[PDB]
Swiss-Prot record, chain A:
Protein name according to UniProt: p51 RT
Effect listed in the UniProt record for changing residue 181 to A: Almost complete loss of polymerase activity
Segment of the intact protein contained: 602 to 1027 of 1447
Effect recorded for residue 181 to F: 70% loss of polymerase activity. No loss of polymerase activity
Effect listed in the UniProt record for changing residue 151 to F: 10% loss of DNA-directed DNA polymerase activity. 22% loss of RNA-directed DNA polymerase activity
Length: 413, 554
DNA sequence: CAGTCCCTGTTCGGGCGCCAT
DNA sequence: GCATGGCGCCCGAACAGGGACTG
């Protein structure tokens, strides 16, 4: 309804998306038709044909508590091309101190983008197909008129509009910062929770005034503390145990340059038995403590730089627990995280993984405001099959697949 | 006939012109059965002659239909397709008869000459000019443009399929209670109605098309078990594939085996147990289709038994949305998997076959995991639900799997069907070192320019064994060392190596392999009742590994 | 260290199956 | 100088990325 059409300057020679559409279940399939019809009726989306050399897939989500199927467009591929647009020309600043709060809340400002209408030339690129079951009919094809739900350019355009919409709250609460990312608001305060959760419902009305009604959940950045590497301690040190312990102490060598292992390996000289117990010397304990102390303060000489993508790596650990890392350059880690199980009665590797990813992503945005490529400890096939059935977010990260197993009893746990 | 629907704007790839390739000589009989077709078309307005101002030409031929009576006017726009915008296809996975629900009354109708009824884009007709010779090739013949939808364009079906959807849309809104399966110009109609209103609805639909320029000849179903749809036989309660006739010839060529395998794969649908792991093992090698090749003794075994299963007459059943869905899988040959999907104890919906080597060193459960995800991502396509499974695996066999494994995995609701062979993880490494076992320190090395190398070990009780190597690889040498330690050791072993590579493959606890050496390493592993294996830095001051590295010198 | 070699695993193209034009 | 589109199977060519060795 408002304004005019913003011109999207795409990279020269660069062509748009061409991702095929991947089969869906009746649950999401039936949830999607209508969803589109409603958007078709309200003139948000039009209907197109094969004349369009572009596509992108679509699927239905169903987040917890709410029983409203949200429609998500995997604009995962399209965004990388429009990076010039939503990074340079229309850049949404990131509040340095956003992470330094005692509570932040996730707001779903999705439907608030169907206001402004899309450029006419660029509309071409945003097409999507909706498959029929057992191919009852050739999947119908549609296209977008108004700002899309997922595109990372939607809020780079709405950015002018949104700041004026939050003018009063931001101007009268200097202790409450906010961050807009894709299709989800990020409001973080500092005061008590009971006097915070009320500021949220109060911010919901402010927006509800100009047509936003979408009910999020609590999360505090102060709860997050670093977990380095713990060098086990025992009374009886078998050769076998000293073998592994040097291994772990060797990887540490690449991260911390002050790691010494010589003195320690000197007591293994000569082919010895494996179970055979060995007593620790004076110079060995002068290092066992030397290393256990140097393994406290993060790696000196490492800073953040937005000039390079963000990379995330996860390693299973068992019991349903998982552990991950977040770095810019190999071995120059940024955050050394850890993930706990959601408790019992939910013994599922895939579900926890998808959960871990979101729980990592969220902290990527919050903290810096980018999204990391996930080296995912799972098979391309084993994931592409249920990575939706357990997804509950309005954002999709870039990722890859690692298959290499841990070496020395996992260098972390 | 033409002009009922709107023309889709098609453009030529930017920078390029149109097709300027001469028409090649044709069979003398074809021309007289072709010109006889071009005039009937110009008569109905499908085509129109042009002048010399049109410098575009594109070869054309002809071929009898699936009947042998009527012919088919085919054009070769291979040089155009390279110049026509890259459309996006709208057609997806073909429909399947096991996904059909039972309807009290059903009929299917077909459109005659369907491509020749959709108006082609206006300013694009100028690039579809074909030149037809006379009769004796004395004087140049006629040259008309494909005023209508061509037959060999770049995305011809994409436009038709799309247009066919828009024409049926209005009829779907008024009648959203009846079933409609539109594949090309062939559509399957049917509902739980009655003869009276049904036939009226059929006439209602025929006349709906008739007005849209879609004439349907009296070539529609007659409402009997003999229902020709998508190449099958849709009976009222059962269903079978196209009466399949397997080719049998004394000698076979690379091509003649291809025409069999694919024909055999098609029968994997309703027919259970059909495999071709070996039959295809002959397709290996950069072969030419005409090249003659004799069947292997194992290959002649499959082809002989498969020839007997096809002799057996079988039928599938239709889907019921109220009842539960169970897919039962079982293992067959080496790296072979066949599965039957059903809902009634004996009536199957669609059987299958999974046979792939996902990696150099797999495993039986590792293959079974993927043999499950292949049926899932194919069961979702037919029905929007992931079915329950009847797997031949013990619940403790799986539990131990994903608990000691690194790459996350998982399988849906499954039970344990006790049908041999039952998949099991044979051997198992020990988490902790063993006491009273010889501590083999194994390592290997190889030269990059000579390709030869020494691989060996040493122990705690003084045990040394190093041998040479003709043409091995540094990484391969390390693997050899591990092999030695399994021949020169008792039921209890302790092994430590400097190579993750080496560590890796074992850690995963594999069954099959394609390295011969590794396929052998397991043979031992299976027997040794308690094994432990540790790792250690390569070029490090570590003890034990210090000396065996020194031993593989020169 | 930048440069090579191995080894694995994914992606592409080519021919066949079947459906339809 | 013998066509299009879709899905499927199978197979070797090409491409990719990670670890270990080398002047």
């Amino acid at each position: 309804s408002p304004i005019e059409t913003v011109p999207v300057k795409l990279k020269p020679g660069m062509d748009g998306p061409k991702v095929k559409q991947w089969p869906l279940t009746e649950e999401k399939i039936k949830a999607l038709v209508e969803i589109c019809t409603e958007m078709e009726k309200e003139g948000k989306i039009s209907k197109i044909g094969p004349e369009n050399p572009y596509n992108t897939p679509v699927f239905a989500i169903k987040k917890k508590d709410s029983t409203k199927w949200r429609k998500l467009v995997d604009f995962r591929e399209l965004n990388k091309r429009t990076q010039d647009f939503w990074e340079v020309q229309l850049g949404i600043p990131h509040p340095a101190g956003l992470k330094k709060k005692k509570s932040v809340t996730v707001l779903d400002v999705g439907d608030a983008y169907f206001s402004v209408p899309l450029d006419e030339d660029f509309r071409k690129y945003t097409a999507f197909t909706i498959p029929s079951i057992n191919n009852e009919t050739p999947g119908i094809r549609y296209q977008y008129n108004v700002l899309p739900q997922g595109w990372k350019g939607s809020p780079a355009i709405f950015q002018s509009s949104m700041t004026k919409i939050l003018e009063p709250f931001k101007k009268q609460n200097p202790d409450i910062v906010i961050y807009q990312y894709m299709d989800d608001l990020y409001v973080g305060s500092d005061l008590e929770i009971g006097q915070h959760r009320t500021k949220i419902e109060e911010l919901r009305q402010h927006l509800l005034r100009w047509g936003l009604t979408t009910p999020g959940y609590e999360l505090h950045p102060d709860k997050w503390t670093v977990q380095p590497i713990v060098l086990p301690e025992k009374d009886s040190w078998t050769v076998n145990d000293i073998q592994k312990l040097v291994g772990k102490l060797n990887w540490a060598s690449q991260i911390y340059p002050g790691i010494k292992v010589r003195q320690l390996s000197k007591l293994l000289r000569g082919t010895k038995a494996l179970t055979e117990v060995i007593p620790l010397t004076e110079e060995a304990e002068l290092e066992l403590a030397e290393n256990r102390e140097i393994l406290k303060e993060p790696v000196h000489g490492v800073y953040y730089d937005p000039s390079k993508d963000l990379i995330a790596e996860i390693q299973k650990q068992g019991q349903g627990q998982w552990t991950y890392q977040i770095y810019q350059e190999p071995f120059k880690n940024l955050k050394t995280g850890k993930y706990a199980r959601m408790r019992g009665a939910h013994t599922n590797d895939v579900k926890q993984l998808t959960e871990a990813v979101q729980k990592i992503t969220t902290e990527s945005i919050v903290i810096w405001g980018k999204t990391p490529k996930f080296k995912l400890p799972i098979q391309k096939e084993t994931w592409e099959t249920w990575w939706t059935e357990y997804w509950q977010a309005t954002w999709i990260p870039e990722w890859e697949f690692v298959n290499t197993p841990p070496l020395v009893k996992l260098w972390y746990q | 006939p033409i002009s009922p629907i709107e023309t889709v704007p098609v453009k030529l790839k930017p920078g390029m012109d149109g097709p300027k390739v001469k028409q090649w000589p044709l069979t003398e009989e074809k021309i007289k059965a072709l010109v006889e077709i071009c005039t009937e078309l110009e008569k109905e307005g499908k085509i129109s002659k042009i002048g010399p101002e049109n410098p575009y030409n594109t070869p054309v031929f002809a071929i009898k239909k699936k009947n042998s009576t009527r012919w088919r006017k085919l054009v070769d726009f291979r040089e155009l397709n390279k110049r026509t915008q890259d459309f996006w296809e709208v057609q997806l996975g073909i429909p399947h008869p096991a996904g059909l629900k039972k309807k009290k009354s059903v009929t299917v109708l077909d459109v005659g000459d369907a491509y020749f009824s959709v108006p082609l884009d206006e300013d694009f007709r100028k690039y579809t000019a074909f030149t037809i010779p006379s009769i004796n090739n004395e004087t140049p013949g006629i040259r008309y443009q494909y005023n209508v939808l061509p037959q060999g364009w770049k995305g011809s079906p994409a436009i038709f399929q799309s247009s066919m959807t828009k024409i049926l849309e209005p009829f779907k809104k008024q009648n959203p209670d009846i079933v409609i399966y539109q594949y090309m110009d062939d559509l399957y109609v049917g509902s739980d109605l009655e003869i009276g209103q049904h036939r009226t609805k059929i006439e209602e639909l025929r006349q709906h098309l008739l007005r849209w320029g879609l004439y349907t000849p009296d070539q529609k179903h007659q409402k009997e078990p003999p229902f020709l749809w998508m190449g099958y036989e849709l009976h009222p309660d059962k269903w079978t594939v196209q009466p399949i006739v397997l080719p049998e010839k004394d000698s076979w060529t690379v091509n003649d085996i291809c025409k069999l395998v694919g024909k055999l794969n098609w029968a994997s649908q309703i027919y259970p147990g059909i495999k071709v792991r070996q039959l295809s093992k002959l397709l290996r090698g950069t072969k030419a289709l005409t090249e003659v090749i004799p069947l292997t003794e194992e290959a002649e075994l499959e082809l002989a038994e498969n020839r007997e299963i096809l002799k057996e007459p079988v039928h599938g059943v239709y889907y019921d949305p109220s009842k539960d869905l169970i897919a039962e899988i079982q293992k067959q040959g080496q790296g072979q998997w066949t599965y039957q999907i059903y809902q009634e104890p004996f009536k199957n919906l669609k059987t299958g076959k999974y046979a792939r080597m996902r990696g150099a060193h797999t495993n039986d459960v590792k293959q079974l995991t993927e043999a499950v995800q292949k049926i899932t991502t194919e069961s979702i396509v037919i029905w929007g639900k992931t079915p329950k499974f009847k797997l031949p695996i013990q619940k403790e066999t799986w539990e131990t799997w994903w608990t000691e494994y690194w790459q996350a995995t998982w399988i849906p609701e499954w039970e344990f069907v006790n049908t041999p062979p039952l998949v099991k993880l044979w051997y198992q490494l020990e988490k902790e070192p063993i006491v009273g076992a010889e501590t083999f320190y194994v390592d290997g090395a190889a030269n990059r320019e000579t390709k030869l190398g020494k691989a060996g070990y040493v122990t705690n009780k003084g045990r040394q064994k190093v041998v040479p190597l003709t043409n091995t690889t540094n990484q391969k040498t390390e693997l050899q060392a591990i092999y030695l330690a399994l021949q020169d050791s008792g039921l209890e072993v302790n092994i430590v190596t400097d190579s993750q590579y080496a560590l890796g493959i074992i850690q995963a606890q594999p069954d099959k392999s394609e390295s011969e050496l590794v396929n052998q390493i397991i043979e031992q592993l299976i027997k040794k009742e308690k094994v432990y294996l540790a790792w250690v830095p390569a070029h490090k001051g570590i003890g034990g590994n210090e000396q065996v590295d020194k031993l593989v010198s020169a």
